[PDB]
Coordinates of C-alpha atoms and ligand atoms in Angstrom, one line a residue:
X1 CA 63.4 96.7 50.1
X2 CA 62.2 98.2 46.8
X3 CA 60.6 100.9 48.8
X4 CA 63.9 102.3 50.1
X5 CA 64.5 105.8 48.9
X6 CA 63.0 108.0 51.6
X7 CA 66.3 109.6 52.8
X8 CA 69.4 111.7 52.0
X9 CA 71.8 112.7 49.3
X10 CA 73.8 109.5 49.8
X11 CA 71.9 106.5 48.5
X12 CA 71.9 103.5 50.9
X13 CA 69.9 100.2 50.9
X14 CA 67.9 100.8 47.8
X15 CA 67.8 97.0 47.6
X16 CA 67.9 94.6 50.6
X17 CA 68.5 90.8 50.9
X18 CA 64.8 89.9 51.1
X19 CA 64.2 91.4 47.6
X20 CA 67.5 92.0 45.8
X21 CA 67.9 93.7 42.4
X22 CA 68.4 91.1 39.7
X23 CA 71.1 92.4 37.5
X24 CA 72.7 90.9 34.4
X25 CA 76.4 90.4 33.8
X26 CA 77.6 92.3 30.8
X27 CA 81.3 91.4 31.0
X28 CA 83.8 89.5 33.1
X29 CA 87.4 90.5 32.2
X30 CA 90.7 89.3 33.7
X31 CA 92.9 91.9 35.4
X32 CA 95.9 89.7 36.3
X33 CA 98.3 89.4 33.4
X34 CA 100.2 86.3 32.5
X35 CA 103.0 85.7 35.1
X36 CA 100.8 87.1 37.8
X37 CA 99.5 85.5 41.0
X38 CA 95.8 84.6 41.2
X39 CA 92.6 85.6 39.5
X40 CA 91.1 89.0 39.8
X41 CA 88.2 89.9 37.5
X42 CA 86.6 93.1 36.5
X43 CA 82.9 92.4 36.3
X44 CA 80.3 94.8 34.9
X45 CA 76.6 94.5 35.6
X46 CA 73.6 96.0 33.9
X47 CA 71.5 98.1 36.2
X48 CA 68.7 98.9 33.8
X49 CA 65.2 97.8 34.8
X50 CA 65.9 98.9 38.4
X51 CA 66.7 102.0 40.5
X52 CA 70.1 101.1 42.0
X53 CA 72.0 104.4 42.3
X54 CA 75.4 104.7 44.2
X55 CA 78.3 107.0 44.7
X56 CA 82.1 106.5 44.9
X57 CA 83.4 104.7 47.9
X58 CA 80.3 102.6 48.5
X59 CA 79.8 98.8 48.3
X60 CA 77.1 96.4 47.1
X61 CA 76.3 92.9 48.3
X62 CA 76.1 89.8 46.0
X63 CA 74.1 86.8 47.2
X64 CA 75.7 83.7 45.6
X65 CA 73.5 80.7 44.8
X66 CA 73.7 77.4 46.8
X67 CA 73.6 76.3 50.4
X68 CA 76.4 76.2 52.9
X69 CA 77.6 73.0 54.7
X70 CA 74.6 73.1 57.1
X71 CA 72.2 73.3 54.2
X72 CA 71.4 77.0 54.9
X73 CA 71.1 79.5 52.0
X74 CA 74.3 81.4 51.3
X75 CA 74.4 84.9 52.7
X76 CA 75.6 88.0 50.9
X77 CA 79.2 89.0 50.6
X78 CA 80.2 92.7 50.3
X79 CA 82.3 94.1 47.5
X80 CA 83.5 97.7 47.0
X81 CA 82.0 99.3 43.9
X82 CA 84.8 99.6 41.4
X83 CA 83.1 102.1 39.1
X84 CA 82.1 105.7 39.5
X85 CA 78.4 106.6 39.9
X86 CA 78.2 106.8 36.1
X87 CA 79.6 103.3 35.5
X88 CA 82.5 102.4 33.3
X89 CA 80.8 103.6 30.1
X90 CA 79.7 106.9 31.8
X91 CA 76.1 106.1 30.9
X92 CA 74.6 105.7 34.3
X93 CA 73.5 102.2 33.4
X94 CA 76.1 99.9 35.0
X95 CA 78.2 99.0 38.0
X96 CA 81.5 97.2 38.2
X97 CA 83.3 95.1 40.8
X98 CA 86.9 94.0 41.2
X99 CA 86.8 90.5 42.5
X100 CA 89.7 88.3 43.6
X101 CA 89.1 84.6 43.7
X102 CA 89.7 83.4 47.2
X103 CA 91.5 80.1 47.4
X104 CA 93.6 78.5 50.2
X105 CA 95.3 75.9 52.4
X106 CA 95.2 72.3 53.7
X107 CA 95.0 73.0 57.5
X108 CA 91.3 73.8 56.8
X109 CA 90.1 70.2 55.8
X110 CA 90.3 68.8 52.3
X111 CA 92.9 70.4 50.0
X112 CA 92.5 73.6 48.0
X113 CA 89.5 75.5 49.3
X114 CA 87.7 77.9 47.0
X115 CA 85.7 80.9 48.3
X116 CA 82.0 80.5 47.4
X117 CA 81.0 84.0 46.3
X118 CA 84.4 84.9 44.8
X119 CA 84.7 81.7 42.7
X120 CA 81.1 82.3 41.6
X121 CA 81.7 85.8 40.6
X122 CA 85.1 85.2 38.9
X123 CA 83.7 82.5 36.7
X124 CA 80.4 84.1 35.9
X125 CA 79.3 84.2 32.2
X126 CA 77.9 87.3 30.4
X127 CA 74.1 87.2 30.4
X128 CA 73.8 85.6 33.8
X129 CA 71.5 87.1 36.4
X130 CA 72.9 88.1 39.8
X131 CA 71.2 89.1 43.1
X132 CA 72.5 92.6 44.1
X133 CA 71.8 94.5 47.3
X134 CA 72.9 97.9 48.5
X135 CA 74.5 100.2 48.1
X136 CA 76.0 100.4 51.6
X137 CA 78.7 102.5 53.3
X138 CA 79.3 106.1 54.2
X139 CA 82.9 105.6 55.5
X140 CA 84.8 105.9 52.2
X141 CA 83.1 108.8 50.6
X142 CA 85.1 111.3 48.6
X143 CA 84.7 115.0 49.5
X144 CA 83.0 117.3 47.0
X145 CA 85.9 119.8 47.6
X146 CA 87.9 119.9 44.3
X147 CA 91.0 121.3 46.2
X148 CA 91.2 118.3 48.5
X149 CA 94.4 116.3 48.8
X150 CA 93.6 112.6 48.7
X151 CA 96.0 110.0 50.0
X152 CA 95.1 106.4 49.0
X153 CA 96.8 103.4 50.5
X154 CA 95.6 100.2 48.9
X155 CA 96.6 96.6 48.6
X156 CA 95.1 94.2 46.0
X157 CA 91.3 94.6 45.5
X158 CA 91.5 97.5 47.9
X159 CA 92.2 99.5 44.7
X160 CA 88.5 99.3 44.0
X161 CA 87.3 102.4 45.8
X162 CA 90.5 104.1 44.7
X163 CA 89.6 103.5 41.1
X164 CA 86.2 105.2 41.6
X165 CA 87.9 108.3 43.0
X166 CA 90.6 108.5 40.4
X167 CA 88.3 107.9 37.5
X168 CA 85.9 110.6 38.8
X169 CA 88.9 113.0 39.3
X170 CA 90.8 112.3 36.1
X171 CA 88.9 110.6 33.2
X172 CA 88.0 112.9 30.3
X173 CA 84.4 111.6 30.2
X174 CA 84.0 112.0 33.9
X175 CA 85.1 115.6 33.9
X176 CA 82.7 116.4 31.0
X177 CA 79.9 114.7 33.0
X178 CA 80.6 116.3 36.4
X179 CA 80.9 120.1 35.8
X180 CA 80.8 120.6 39.6
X181 CA 83.8 118.5 40.3
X182 CA 86.9 119.7 38.4
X183 CA 89.7 118.2 40.6
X184 CA 92.7 120.5 41.1
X185 CA 94.1 119.0 44.3
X186 CA 96.8 116.4 44.8
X187 CA 96.3 112.7 44.8
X188 CA 98.8 110.1 45.8
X189 CA 98.2 106.4 45.4
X190 CA 100.5 103.9 47.1
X191 CA 99.5 100.4 45.7
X192 CA 100.7 97.1 47.1
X193 CA 100.6 94.0 44.9
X194 CA 102.9 91.0 44.6
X195 CA 104.0 91.3 41.0
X196 CA 103.9 93.8 38.0
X197 CA 101.4 91.6 36.2
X198 CA 99.2 91.9 39.3
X199 CA 99.1 95.7 39.1
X200 CA 95.3 96.0 38.6
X201 CA 94.4 98.7 36.1
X202 CA 98.1 99.4 35.5
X203 CA 97.7 100.9 32.0
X204 CA 95.0 103.3 33.1
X205 CA 96.7 104.4 36.4
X206 CA 99.9 105.1 34.5
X207 CA 97.9 107.0 31.8
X208 CA 96.5 109.3 34.5
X209 CA 99.9 109.8 36.0
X210 CA 101.2 110.9 32.6
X211 CA 98.3 113.3 31.9
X212 CA 98.3 114.8 35.4
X213 CA 101.9 114.8 36.8
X214 CA 101.2 117.5 39.2
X215 CA 97.9 116.2 40.5
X216 CA 98.7 112.5 40.8
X217 CA 101.6 110.5 42.1
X218 CA 101.7 106.8 41.7
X219 CA 103.8 104.6 44.0
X220 CA 104.0 100.8 43.9
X221 CA 105.1 98.3 46.5
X222 CA 105.7 95.1 44.5
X223 CA 106.7 92.4 47.0
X224 CA 108.1 89.8 44.5
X225 CA 110.2 92.3 42.7
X226 CA 111.3 94.9 45.2
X227 CA 113.0 94.7 48.6
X228 CA 112.8 97.1 51.4
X229 CA 116.0 98.4 53.3
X230 CA 115.9 95.5 55.8
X231 CA 116.2 93.0 52.9
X232 CA 112.6 91.8 53.1
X233 CA 109.9 91.9 50.4
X234 CA 108.5 95.4 49.8
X235 CA 105.1 95.9 51.3
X236 CA 102.9 99.0 51.4
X237 CA 103.9 99.7 55.0
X238 CA 107.5 100.0 53.7
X239 CA 106.6 102.7 51.2
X240 CA 104.7 104.5 53.8
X241 CA 107.7 104.5 56.1
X242 CA 109.9 105.6 53.2
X243 CA 107.6 108.6 52.7
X244 CA 106.5 109.1 56.3
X245 CA 107.6 112.7 56.8
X246 CA 106.0 113.7 53.5
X247 CA 102.7 111.9 54.2
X248 CA 102.6 113.5 57.7
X249 CA 103.1 116.9 56.2
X250 CA 100.2 116.4 53.7
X251 CA 98.0 115.0 56.5
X252 CA 98.5 118.3 58.5
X253 CA 96.6 120.1 55.8
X254 CA 93.0 120.7 56.7
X255 CA 91.9 119.6 53.2
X256 CA 93.6 116.3 53.3
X257 CA 91.7 113.0 53.3
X258 CA 93.3 109.6 53.7
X259 CA 91.8 106.3 52.5
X260 CA 93.0 102.9 53.5
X261 CA 91.5 99.8 51.8
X262 CA 92.5 96.1 51.4
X263 CA 93.0 93.0 53.4
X264 CA 93.2 93.6 57.2
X265 CA 96.8 93.8 58.5
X266 CA 98.2 96.9 56.7
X267 CA 97.0 99.4 59.3
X268 CA 99.5 98.6 62.1
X269 CA 102.5 99.3 60.0
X270 CA 101.1 102.5 58.5
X271 CA 100.4 103.9 62.0
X272 CA 103.9 103.0 63.2
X273 CA 105.4 105.0 60.3
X274 CA 103.2 108.0 60.8
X275 CA 103.6 107.9 64.6
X276 CA 107.4 108.2 64.2
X277 CA 107.0 111.2 61.8
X278 CA 104.3 112.9 64.0
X279 CA 106.4 112.4 67.1
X280 CA 109.2 114.7 65.8
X281 CA 106.8 117.7 66.1
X282 CA 105.6 116.6 69.6
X283 CA 102.3 115.1 68.3
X284 CA 101.0 111.6 69.4
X285 CA 99.6 110.1 66.2
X286 CA 97.1 107.9 67.9
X287 CA 95.5 111.0 69.4
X288 CA 95.7 113.0 66.2
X289 CA 94.2 110.1 64.2
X290 CA 91.1 109.9 66.5
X291 CA 90.5 113.6 65.7
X292 CA 90.9 112.9 62.0
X293 CA 88.4 110.1 62.2
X294 CA 86.0 112.2 64.1
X295 CA 86.4 115.0 61.5
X296 CA 85.7 112.4 58.7
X297 CA 89.2 112.7 57.2
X298 CA 90.6 109.3 57.9
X299 CA 88.8 106.6 56.0
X300 CA 89.5 102.9 56.5
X301 CA 87.9 99.8 55.0
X302 CA 89.9 96.6 55.5
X303 CA 88.5 93.1 55.3
Ligands
FAD1 C1 83.3 96.2 52.9 C2 83.9 95.1 52.1 C3 84.3 95.2 50.9 C4 84.9 94.2 50.2 N1 85.4 94.4 49.0 C5 85.9 93.4 48.2 C6 86.4 93.7 46.8 O1 86.3 94.8 46.3 N2 86.9 92.6 46.2 C7 87.1 91.3 46.7 O2 87.6 90.4 46.1 N3 86.7 91.2 48.0 C8 86.1 92.1 48.8 N4 85.7 91.9 50.1 C9 85.8 90.5 50.6 C10 84.5 89.7 50.1 O3 83.4 90.2 50.7 C11 84.4 88.2 50.5 O4 84.8 88.1 51.9 C12 85.5 87.4 49.8 O5 85.3 87.7 48.4 C13 85.5 86.0 50.0 O6 84.2 85.5 49.9 P1 83.9 84.0 49.4 O7 82.5 83.9 49.3 O8 84.7 83.9 48.2 O9 84.5 83.1 50.6 P2 83.9 82.3 51.8 O10 83.5 81.1 51.0 O11 82.9 83.1 52.5 O12 85.1 81.9 52.6 C14 85.5 82.9 53.5 C15 86.1 82.2 54.7 O13 87.3 81.5 54.4 C16 88.3 81.8 55.4 N5 89.6 82.5 54.9 C17 89.8 83.7 54.2 N6 91.0 83.9 53.7 C18 91.7 82.7 54.1 C19 93.1 82.3 54.0 N7 94.0 82.6 53.0 N8 93.5 81.3 54.8 C20 92.6 80.7 55.6 N9 91.3 80.9 55.7 C21 90.9 82.0 54.9 C22 87.5 82.4 56.6 O14 86.9 81.3 57.3 C23 86.5 83.2 55.8 O15 85.3 83.5 56.7 C24 85.1 92.9 50.8 C25 84.6 92.7 52.1 C26 84.0 93.8 52.8 C27 83.6 93.5 54.2

């Protein structure tokens, strides 16, 4: 557990469930604006007093307090790290998460059911101690290649690892802190949310787009405000279909990396769109994609 640093460049499992790192909540800020749907909080934790180090694209576990319905201790839940390795204040002292409160239906006994860890995290007060494990994950890592093209397909909290890439790529303080990574490639974020007030980190994403118009393109798929051509609500798969030929042309570049993150269910529609585009040039997308995965250029993390 605490002895867990005898390997690689990528930090993994510095802390494990049997002896987690006890961090303190610094802040818990709301990301969904009035008129939006649900509760998504940006939570920042203090890492001082421990040796938790991490990089962009990784996740950490949070062990919530309490026991389940069988009286057994609650197990950890994984959350994509929402901050760069340097933390939101670029001081190498914190870590942030983007947590949506899970809440649902009646055909699952009772009435409104609240997710255990997500409700715990979203209502947590500053100063509270939290059990943190990790980091974990080697599937959503960003290439060190500054000339890479990075396609990001995200829905909801799937924006979390995207925020770590984008901040590392475009924030002034990040560029001053990472001399070795001066991004000059092209990044395209297609972000699906139900409403405008639900666009997590809207002000900052749009700020990046304004400062870097040739290096970053921002595309939204807002279901309660936009309709696709078939008359249905606009989802991320619809924007992908809309730009399938373009996305396929970018994917053909040897330097292109594609990242997919969010709730499970988005993948099938994205593949269908890219398959139709790939087919025009006599390529079977399912086969091409396996090669991309093997080459480490197709990154997916859905849950
Ligand atoms: C790698 C990874 C990264 C993740 N990153 C994030 C992140 O950045 N942000 C974030 O918010 N979450 C993230 N998640 C999901 C997160 O780990 C927890 O699953 C989620 O927060 C819910 O946990 P809970 O403790 O709130 O719910 P639980 O109390 O554990 O309830 C979960 C159970 O409720 C059920 N369920 C789920 N949705 C519904 C629904 N609408 N209808 C019916 N039943 C349902 C299932 O039985 C599920 O097992 C990530 C998951 C993984 C695996």
